C-alpha cells in the first residue's frame, strides 16, 4: 500500500538551473511510492513553483538548486507560500555539496521542511529520503476545503483549488455538490474538450491555443485548464506531465489543475464535478485535456460543449479512420505534427472521412473543420487557423469576445515549410554505421591479400634458395598485386620509408623525435610497431596509423604542440573584473593564453541581473556575470584576442549567438583601440573596414552553442529548439561569408550528457550523432562539407569507466572514416578535434582530498589518448567553484603529467596495447549499434521527439545512483572506506559573489541602458524584423549587442522566436 | 642476450614454416601440387626447438582458455575455476588477461617467448596467473618491547 | 634484496635496477659457493624497488622478472619457483617535496599506478606530508591504492601494459641497459670488487648530483619547486 491520503507533489529545478539529474530521480521514487507528481521541469522561478503548488493544492514541494543563490530562493518561496495561503505546504530541497550544512540549518529553521546533503543520501538511502519526505506530506487536505461556494464564486482561485481537492476525493458534502452544479448550469460557460492519441501534441497545442487567446483578447479572458494524465495503478500515484508543456498559463487569469485518471478510463471519475466547479468560479472558458485514448475511445464528448480530436499524420492505412470513434463526434480535428512526412495526404484522408461521417456531400472536403497544425512551431499559421475556427464556434455558443488582433487568415493547413533534416536522409545515422563497418570489412580483406602476397613471394625466394624454381607461385603473387587496392598498395610501399623517418633523432621543417631521460634512455615521441607480417602492417596502417595520418586514430596532428599545451582551465566568478583576475591567474607563466569562460546562471539564461531575490541571489554566482558588451570588454581586457597564441573558450548555449556577437565586437574593438594608439588617430571608414574584416578571420576561440545537447543534456535552451538551430546555422553562414576560419562555431558536446548520468557509450554515441545531425542539417541547407566541417569542435567527459580510456581515439576514427568515405570531405574535415574535461560527478563532497586522485587518473588517459584540450577539476569540486588555492592543485595535475611524468614523454603510449585496441573496437561497434537505434527512431531529431535520449540518460543515471548508495559499485570514501571521524570536508573556503559586485552589475547595467536609451527600442525592433522577414539573425546581433543588453535581446527574441518547451 | 638471439632465430623459422605451408595450401587450391614446398616446411619442423614447437602448438588451446567467462584448471584431484570477465556499467566485458590477435606465427612465438601471459615463462607480465582478490601489513615499532607489542595487539585485533 | 635506498640516494632507474639485480645475483653466487642447491634459497629471495617519475620505472618490474627468470632457468638451471621474482614497490619519497605538499598526492598516484599496471607483488604509498605520519595523512596515502584497485577502470585489466609499442620497446631498452651495467661491474671484479673501489657509491653520488643540478638549473621541471612556485609562500 502507498500513502494514507492522496499525496501530491510539485517538483522542479530552481531558477536558471539546468540541474535536473537530481530532481528527476526523485520524482521517479516519489511516483513509485504512490505519489501524484506534478513535474515542472528545470528553470522555474519561485513565482512559477508557488503558483503551481497552490493551484494543484499539493502537500509538498521538491526543489533542486545547484546554481547557488538557494538561501535567497528558498526564503522567497517560504515567504510567498505563507503570504498566499500555503503555509501548510512543506518545502523540500537538495543541492548536493552546494548547500553547506550552515545554510541547511538556516533554511530549515526559516521554514523549509528538510534539505538533504550528500551525507544524508548515504545514510538514508535514495528510497529512505523519499519515504521520509512522503511520510511528512501524508496529510488530508480536505479539511482546508471551503464549506460554502461564497469564496469560490467570488473569484478566489485558492479556494477553488481546494474545493477541487475535496470534490476529487469525494469528501465534499452532497448538498454542496448539487448546489455547485445548480450554479454551474446557470453559469453558462463553454467547455472545450481536447482529446487524442498519446503524445500527439494535446498539451502543446492547448498551450499554443491559450497563447492565441491571450494575444487576441489582450489577456481579458479567464481560462481554466483541466489536464488529465493516465495513472499507473501498480504504484498508486502518477506522473501528471501536462503542466510542464504549458508556457502560456503563467498569468492571473489562467488557472490549471492536473488530474490523474485514477483508473485503468481516460477521464477522472469526478471530472463532471471538477468542470462544474470551474464553471461556477466564473471562468470565461474551461479547457479539458484527456489522456492517451485509443481508436475506439471517446469519453470526453458528453462532458464538454466542444470537442477537439488531435492526431499525427502517422495513423497507418486510410481505412483506419473508419475505426476511430472520435472522428464521428469531434467538432474540430487537429492533425498536429504537420511537419512530419505524409502530413498533406493525412489531411486529405481525414478531411474526406469527416465529410463522410457528417454526410455533408454538398460541401467541399477542404471546408471541413479539419486543421493541419504544428504546435512545436512558434506562431504557426496552422494553429492560428484552428484558433480562428474555435473562436467562431465558441462565439456562437455564447461567449462575448472583442474583435481579434490576430491575423484573421483563411485555410485549414499550416504552411510551415521549414526542415532541419529532409525525410529522404532520415536514416543518415544508419548509413554512417554501414560506412564504418564497410571500411573494416575492407581492412580484413586487404590484410588477407597483403598477407598471402607476402607468404607467396616468401616461399618463392626460399624455393630458389634450394634450387626448385617454381614460377607457379609468382603467378598467384602477381594475381594479388591487382587484388590489392591502389591506396593499400601505396601504404605498404611507404612503410619502410615511414620507418626510417621516425627512426632518427629528427623528423625532416625539422622536429625532434627523442627525449632523453636522466638514465640516458631515448624515448621516441612516436613508437612504431615491429611487425614482420605485412598483413599486420597494413591492418595497423588502416585501423590505427601514426598520429597525423588517416584515420587519425592516435591523433589528428603529427606531433603535439611545442609551446601551447592542451591545458585550458574553466573559469568564472563574480563580475567581469574579478574573472579577468582569474584569467590572469591561470594563464600566468604561460606564453600561450588559453582561457575558458564560465558564466553565471543568469547570463546562461540570457537574463539581465535584477533586484528580485529569484535572480539577485544568483548574480555572479557559479560564473561571471556578463550583461552588456562593456562587461565582455572588461572580461578580456589585457588579452589580445587577435593574437595567434591566444584562444578563448566561452561555455554558453541558449544565448550563445548573443554572447558570441559580444565577443566578436570586443575582439574588433581591441584592434580599433590598438590602431588609435599606434597612429594617434581614429581609423578611416576604409581603414576600419579592413581592420574589422581582418579581426573576424584571425580571431581564435570556441563557442559551445550545441543546442541538440541542450534538449538532451544540459537544459540551457531558452528559445524554441527549432529557432536555436536556425540561428546556429546563421552563425555558420556568417562565418563562411567573412572567412572566420579560426573560430569554432560549435563545440558539439557530450560532457553534459555524461554528467547527467549517461555512460561513456551513450555519451560518445549521442555526441557523434548530434554532430552528424549538424552535418546533415548544413548539407541540406546548402553548404559544402569542406566549408563547415573544419569549424566543428567537440567536447567530451573523462570518468573512471574503462571505455573513457579509448573514447577520443574512437571518436577520431569514426569521424575520419565517415567524413572521407560517406561525405567525401577533405583532410581538414576528417580531423576531429575535441576538448576533454574530467568528470565532475565522479568527484564527491565526502573526503574531498580523494578527488585529486581521481582527477589525476582521468587527466592521464586524456593526455595519453592525445587530446586537443584538457580541463582539470579542483578537489573541492562538489562544494564550490575552484578557489585560488584549489585551482592551482587542479592546474598542477596537468603540469606534473606533461612535464614530470615519464611515460608522457611518449606521444602514442596507448598504441599497440592489446587492451586498448580491443576496447577501441568494442566501443566503436557499441556506438555504431546505438546509431542504428537512433536511426530507427527517426534520427536524432526523431528520437528527441520521443525523449529517447533523455529517457536513456535518466535511466542510466538511476542505475548508477542505485549502485552508488547500494555499494555494488565501490566509491572510496563514500560507500566504502569511510572516515572514523565522520566529517565531510571543517570550514572550507567558498566562491560566492560579493554584495558590491552584485550592486556593481546593476549600476553598470542601468548606466549602459541610459547610454543607448535612444537606439534601444529601434534596434530591438530591427532584430525582430530580422526573424519575421527570415533574414540572418546573427548578422543583426553583431550590431544589436552594441546598444542592447543581454536581457533586452533575449526578451525581444522571445516575442518572435518563442520559448523552449521542456521535454521531461 | 643469448636467449633473445634464440627468440629472433626461432621466430624466423616459425614464420618461414607458416609461409611455406600457407603457399602450399594456396597452390593446391589452384591445382598445382608442388610438394617441393613441403620439403622445406618439414625441414623447419626439425629446425624449431622442442619447447618452441610446443609453445605454438598450445597457442590455439591457450586462446580458448582466456576466451570464455571462466578459467577452468584442475589441480590435484579437484579444480580451480577463476573468473575472467568484469562487466562495466555500460555492459562491456573487460577481460582480465587480453591476448594478442596476431596471424603471423612468427609474432606469436616472438611474443610467447619474450612476454608470455601472466603466470608463464618468462613471467614478464607477472609471476602469477591472476591477481589475488582481497594484504595490508601492520607496521609498528616504538619505545620499549612492551609498547610495540601493545600496538601490535591493538592493530591486529 | 633492496634497491630503494640506492635510488633514494640519487641513482636513476637503470642504476637502481642494475645494482639491485647484481646484488641479488651476488647472494646467489655466494650461497652456491657454499655448496648449496639453487632451489633451496632462490624461492626465498625477495626484492624491493622504487617507483619514480622517470619513464623507465614503468617497465622496471617486468624487466626484473624477465632477467631473473631467463638467468635462473638457463644459467643456474633452477626450478619454476626460483625463476619467479617477487618484489615490493614503494613510491619514490625523493620525488615528493616540502613545497606545496598537496601536489605530492598527484605524483604518488601516478607512481602507484604504473606499479599496479606492471603487476607488482606488494605496494607502499607515500603520504602527502615533512611532518609526523599523521593518521589523516596515511589515509590519503592508503586511499590512492584503494581508488586504483577498486574504482579505476583500466585497472580491471591485469595486463594493460602488454602489447604497447612503447612498453615493449622500453622493456627491451632498459633490459639491455642493465646488462651493459652488469658488464661494467663484472670488469671491476664483480659487485664485491666494485664496492672495493666504491664504484656503486661513486656512480650513485654522481647521478644524485646531476639530478640535483638540473633541478636547480631549471632544466628539470618540478611543479611547485623550480616552476609554478607558490605566489604566497
Ligand atoms: C552533473 C552536473 C552538471 C551537469 C548537469 C546535468 C543535469 N542534467 O542535471 C552539467 C554538466 C550540464 C552541469 C552544468 C553546469 N553546472 Co554543474 N555540476 C554537476 C555535478 C558534477 C553533480 C550534480 C549532480 O547532478 N549530482 C547528482 C546528485 C544525484 O547527487 P548529489 O548532488 O550528491 O545529491 C544527493 C543529496 O543531496 C540528495 N539531493 C540532492 N538534490 C535533491 C533534491 C531533492 C528533492 C531531494 C529529496 C534530495 C536531493 O540526493 C543525492 C543522494 O546521493 C556538480 C558537482 C558535484 N559533484 O557536486 C556540478 C555543479 C553543481 N555545477 C556547477 C555549475 C557552476 C554549473 C554551470 C552553471 C557551469 C557554467 N557556468 O556554465 C553549468 C550550467 C548548468 C545549467 N544548465 O544551468 C557548480 C555549482 C557551483 C555553485 N553553485 O556554487 C558545481 C557544484 C560544480 C563546481 N564545483 O563548479 N552541471
Ligand atoms: C558548463 C558545463 C561545463 C562545460 O561545458 S566546460 C566547457 C569547456 N570547453 C572548452 O574548454 C572547449 C575548448 N576547446 C576548444 O577551444 C576547441 O575545441 C579546440 C579545437 C580544442 C581548441 O584547441 P586549439 O589549441 O585552439 O587548437 P587548434 O586546432 O585550433 O590549432 C590552431 C592551429 O594551430 C596549428 N596546430 C595546432 N596544434 C597543432 C599540432 N599539434 N601540430 C601542428 N599544428 C598544430 C594548426 O594550423 C591549427 O589550425 P588548422 O589545423 O590549420 O585549422
Ligand atoms: O600470502 P603469501 O605471500 O604468504 O602466499 C602464500 C602462497 O600463495 C601463493 N600466492 C600468493 N599470491 C598468489 C597469486 N596471486 N596467485 C597464485 N599464487 C599466489 C604464494 O606463492 C604462496 O605459495 P607457495 O608457498 O610459494 O607455494
Ligand atoms: N515534430 C513535432 N512535434 C511536436 C509538435 N507538437 C508537439 N510536438 C512534440 O510532441 C511531444 C509531446 O507533446 P505533448 O504536448 O506532450 O503531447 P500530449 O502528451 O499527447 O499532450 C513533445 O516533444 C512536443 O515537443 C509538432 O507540431 N511537430
Ligand atoms: C560541469 C562542470 O564544470 C566545472 N565548472 C563549473 N563551473 C565552474 C567554474 N566557475 N570554474 C571552474 N570549473 C567550473 C565543474 O568541474 C563542473 O563539474
Ligand atoms: Mg499531455
Ligand atoms: Mg494528457
Amino acid at each position: 500500500r502507498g500513502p494514507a491520503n492522496k499525496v501530491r507533489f510539485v517538483t522542479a529545478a530552481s531558477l536558471f538551473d539546468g540541474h535536473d539529474a537530481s530532481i528527476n530521480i526523485m520524482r521517479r521514487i516519489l511516483q513509485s511510492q504512490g505519489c501524484e507528481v506534478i513535474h515542472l521541469g528545470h528553470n522555474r522561478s519561485v513565482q512559477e513553483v508557488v503558483t503551481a503548488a497552490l493551484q494543484e493544492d499539493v502537500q509538498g514541494i521538491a526543489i533542486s538548486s545547484y546554481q547557488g543563490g538557494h538561501v535567497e530562493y528558498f526564503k522567497y518561496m517560504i515567504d510567498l507560500l505563507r503570504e498566499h495561503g500555503g503555509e501548510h505546504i512543506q518545502v523540500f530541497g537538495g543541492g548536493g555539496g552546494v548547500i553547506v550544512p550552515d545554510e541547511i540549518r538556516e533554511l530549515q529553521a526559516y521554514g523549509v521542511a528538510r534539505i538533504y546533503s550528500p551525507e544524508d543520501g548515504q545514510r538514508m538511502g535514495l528510497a529512505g529520503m523519499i519515504t521520509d519526505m512522503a511520510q511528512r506530506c501524508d496529510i488530508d487536505l480536505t479539511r482546508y476545503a471551503p464549506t460554502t461556494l461564497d469564496t469560490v464564486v467570488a473569484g478566489d482561485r485558492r479556494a477553488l483549488a481546494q474545493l477541487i481537492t475535496a470534490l476529487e476525493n469525494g469528501k465534499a458534502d452532497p448538498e454542496l455538490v448539487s448546489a455547485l452544479h445548480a450554479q454551474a448550469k446557470a453559469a453558462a460557460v463553454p467547455v472545450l474538450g481536447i482529446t487524442g492519441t498519446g503524445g500527439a501534441g494535446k498539451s502543446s497545442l492547448t498551450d499554443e491555443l491559450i497563447r492565441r487567446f491571450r494575444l487576441d483578447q489582450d489577456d481579458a479572458l479567464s481560462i481554466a485548464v483541466i489536464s488529465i494524465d493516465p495513472s499507473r495503478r501498480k504504484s498508486g500515484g502518477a506522473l501528471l506531465g501536462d503542466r510542464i508543456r504549458m508556457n502560456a498559463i503563467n498569468h492571473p487569469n489562467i488557472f490549471m489543475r492536473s488530474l490523474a485518471t485514477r483508473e485503468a478510463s481516460e477521464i477522472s471519475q469526478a471530472l463532471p464535478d471538477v468542470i462544474a466547479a470551474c464553471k461556477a468560479a466564473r471562468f470565461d472558458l474551461v479547457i479539458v485535456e484527456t489522456s492517451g485514448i485509443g481508436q475506439g475511445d471517446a469519453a470526453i464528448v458528453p462532458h464538454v460543449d466542444l470537442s477537439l480530436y488531435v492526431m499525427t499524420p502517422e495513423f497507418g492505412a486510410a481505412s483506419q479512420l473508419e475505426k476511430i470513434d472520435m472522428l464521428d463526434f469531434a467538432d474540430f480535428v487537429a492533425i498536429n505534427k504537420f511537419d512530419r512526412k505524409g502530413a498533406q495526404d493525412a489531411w486529405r484522408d481525414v478531411a474526406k472521412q469527416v465529410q463522410r461521417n457528417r454526410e455533408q456531400w454538398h460541401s467541399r472536403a477542404e471546408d471541413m473543420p479539419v486543421y493541419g497544425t504544428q504546435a512545436s512551431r512558434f506562431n504557426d499559421d496552422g494553429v492560428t487557423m484552428l484558433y480562428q475556427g474555435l473562436v467562431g464556434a465558441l462565439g456562437a455558443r455564447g461567449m462575448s469576445l472583442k474583435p481579434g488582433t490576430l491575423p484573421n487568415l483563411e485555410g485549414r493547413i499550416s504552411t510551415g515549410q521549414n526542415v532541419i533534416v529532409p525525410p529522404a536522409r532520415s536514416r543518415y545515422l544508419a548509413e554512417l554505421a554501414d560506412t564504418v563497418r564497410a571500411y573494416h570489412r575492407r581492412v580484413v580483406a586487404q590484410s588477407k591479400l597483403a598477407r598471402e602476397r607476402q607468404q607467396l613471394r616468401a616461399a618463392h625466394d626460399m624455393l630458389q634458395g634450394a634450387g626448385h624454381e617454381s614460377a607457379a607461385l609468382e603467378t598467384l603473387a602477381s594475381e594479388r598485386d591487382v587484388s590489392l587496392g591502389a591506396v593499400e598498395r601505396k601504404l605498404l610501399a611507404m612503410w619502410p620509408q615511414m620507418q626510417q623517418a621516425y627512426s632518427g633523432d629528427e623528423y625532416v621543417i625539422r622536429t625532434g623525435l627523442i627525449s632523453t631521460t636522466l638514465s640516458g634512455t631515448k624515448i621516441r615521441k612516436v613508437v612504431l610497431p615491429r611487425f614482420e607480417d605485412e598483413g599486420e602492417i597494413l591492418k595497423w596502417l588502416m585501423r590505427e596509423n601514426v598520429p597525423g595520418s588517416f584515420p587519425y586514430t592516435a591523433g589528428v596532428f603529427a606531433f603535439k604542440r611545442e609551446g601551447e599545451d592542451p591545458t585550458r582551465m574553466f573559469a568564472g566568478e563574480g563580475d567581469a573584473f574579478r574573472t579577468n583576475r582569474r584569467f590572469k591567474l591561470v594563464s600566468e607563466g604561460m606564453e600561450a593564453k588559453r582561457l575558458s569562460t564560465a558564466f553565471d546562471s543568469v547570463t546562461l539564461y540570457g537574463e539581465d541581473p535584477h533586484e528580485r531575490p529569484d535572480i539577485y541571489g544568483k548574480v555572479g554566482n557559479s560564473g561571471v556575470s556578463i550583461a552588456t558588451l562593456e562587461d565582455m570588454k572588461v572580461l578580456y581586457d589585457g588579452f589580445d584576442l587577435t593574437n595567434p597564441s591566444t584562444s578563448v573558450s566561452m561555455t554558453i548555449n541558449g544565448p550563445a549567438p548573443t554572447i558570441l556577437a559580444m565577443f566578436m565586437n570586443t575582439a574588433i574593438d581591441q584592434q580599433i583601440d590598438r590602431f588609435r594608439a599606434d597612429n594617434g588617430r581614429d581609423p578611416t571608414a576604409d581603414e576600419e573596414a579592413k581592420i574589422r574584416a581582418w579581426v573576424l578571420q584571425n580571431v581564435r576561440g570556441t563557442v559551445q552553442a550545441d543546442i541538440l545537447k541542450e534538449d538532451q543534456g544540459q537544459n540551457t535552451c531558452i528559445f524554441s529548439t527549432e529557432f536555436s538551430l536556425k540561428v546556429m546555422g546563421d552563425i555558420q553562414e556568417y562565418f563562411v561569408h567573412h572567412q572566420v576560419r579560426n573560430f569554432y562555431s560549435v563545440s558539439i558536446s557530450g560532457y553534459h550528457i555524461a554528467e547527467a548520468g549517461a555512460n561513456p557509450i551513450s555519451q560518445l554515441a549521442f555526441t557523434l550523432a548530434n554532430g552528424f545531425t549538424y552535418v546533415e542539417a548544413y548539407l541540406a541547407r546548402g553548404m559544402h562539407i569542406d566549408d563547415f566541417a573544419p569549424n566543428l569542435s567537440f567536447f567530451f567527459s573523462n570518468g573512471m569507466d574503462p571505455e573513457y580510456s579509448v573514447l577520443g581515439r574512437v571518436a577520431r576514427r569514426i569521424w575520419a572514416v565517415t567524413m572521407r568515405d560517406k561525405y567525401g570531405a577533405n583532410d581538414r574535415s576528417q580531423k576531429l578535434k575535441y576538448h576533454i574535461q574530467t568528470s565532475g560527478r565522479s568527484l564527491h563532497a565526502q573526503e574531498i582530498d580523494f578527488n585529486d586522485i581521481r582527477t589525476t587518473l582521468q587527466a592521464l588517459i586524456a593526455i595519453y589518448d592525445n587530446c586537443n584540450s584538457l580541463h582539470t577539476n579542483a578537489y573541492d569540486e562538489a562544494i564550490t567553484t575552484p578557489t585560488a588555492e584549489s585551482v592551482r592543485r587542479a592546474l598542477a595535475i596537468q603540469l606534473i603529467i606533461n612535464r614530470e611524468w615519464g611515460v608522457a614523454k611518449c606521444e602514442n603510449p596507448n598504441q599497440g596495447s592489446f587492451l586498448i585496441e580491443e576496447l577501441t573496437d568494442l566501443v566503436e561497434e557499441a556506438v555504431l549499434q546505438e546509431f542504428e537505434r537512433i536511426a530507427e527512431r527517426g534520427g536524432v531529431l526523431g528520437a528527441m521527439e520521443t525523449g529517447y535520449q533523455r529517457g536513456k540518460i535518466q535511466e542510466e543515471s538511476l542505475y548508477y545512483e542505485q549502485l552508488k548508495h547500494d555499494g555494488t559499485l565501490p566509491i572510496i570514501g563514500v560507500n566504502t572506506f569511510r572516515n572514523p571521524n565522520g566529517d565531510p570536508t571543517q570550514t572550507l573556503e567558498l566562491a560566492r559573489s560579493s554584495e558590491d559586485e552584485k550592486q556593481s552589475q546593476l549600476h553598470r547595467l542601468t548606466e549602459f541602458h541610459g547610454a543607448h536609451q535612444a537606439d534601444a527600442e529601434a534596434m530591438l525592433a530591427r532584430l525582430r524584423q530580422a526573424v519575421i522577414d527570415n533574414r540572418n539573425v546573427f548578422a543583426v546581433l553583431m550590431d544589436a549587442v552594441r546598444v542592447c543588453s543581454l536581457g533586452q535581446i533575449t526578451h525581444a527574441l522571445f516575442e518572435v522566436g518563442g520559448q523552449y518547451r521542456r521535454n521531461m | 642476450r643469448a636467449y633473445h638471439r634464440r627468440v629472433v632465430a626461432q621466430s624466423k623459422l616459425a614464420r618461414e614454416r607458416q609461409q611455406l605451408r600457407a603457399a602450399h595450401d594456396m597452390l593446391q587450391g589452384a591445382g598445382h601440387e608442388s610438394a617441393a614446398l613441403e620439403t622445406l616446411a618439414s625441414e623447419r619442423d626439425v629446425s624449431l626447438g622442442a619447447v618452441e614447437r610446443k609453445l605454438l602448438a598450445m597457442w590455439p588451446q591457450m586462446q580458448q582458455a582466456y576466451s570464455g567467462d571462466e578459467y577452468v584448471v584442475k589441480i590435484r584431484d579437484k579444480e580451480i575455476r577463476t573468473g575472467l570477465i568484469s562487466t562495466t556499467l555500460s555492459g562491456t566485458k573487460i577481460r582480465k588477461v587480453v591476448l594478442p590477435r596476431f596471424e603471423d606465427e612468427g609474432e606469436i612465438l616472438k611474443w610467447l617467448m619474450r612476454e608470455n601471459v601472466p603466470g608463464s615463462f618468462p613471467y614478464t607480465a607477472g609471476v602469477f596467473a591472476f591477481k589475488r582478490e582481497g594484504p595490508t601489513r601492520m607496521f609498528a615499532g616504538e619505545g620499549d618491547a612492551f609498547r610495540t607489542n601493545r600496538r601490535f595487539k591493538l592493530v591486529s585485533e
Side-chain angles (χ1 to χ4, degrees), chain A residues 517 519 521 524 800 847 854 888 900 902 909 911-913 970 972:
Chain A
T517 82
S519 315
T521 304
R524 295 200 290 142
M800 306 293 287
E847 302 276 22
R854 300 183 182 93
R888 285 194 70 262
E900 297 191 22
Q911 264 179 332
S913 171
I972 307 306

Side-chain angles (χ1 to χ4, degrees), chain A residues 90-134 136:
Chain A
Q90 291 186 284
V91 177
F92 299 85
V98 176
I99 312 181
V100 296
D102 283 38
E103 290 167 348
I104 298 184
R105 305 188 202 98
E106 178 179 3
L107 286 175
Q108 288 185 185
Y110 195 98
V112 177
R114 269 296 294 274
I115 287 190
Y116 299 90
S117 65
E119 271 296 87
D120 291 335
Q122 272 303 318
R123 182 185 65 259
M124 303 180 63
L126 289 177
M129 284 183 298
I130 307 302
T131 298
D132 174 38
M133 197 171 66
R136 291 176 188 254

Side-chain angles (χ1 to χ4, degrees), chain A residues 603-607 652-660 716 718-719 1046 1050:
Chain A
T603 297
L604 288 178
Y605 282 72
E607 297 288 341
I652 181 74
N653 287 320
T658 303
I659 295 302
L660 178 59
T716 331
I718 42 180
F719 311 120
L1046 176 64
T1050 297

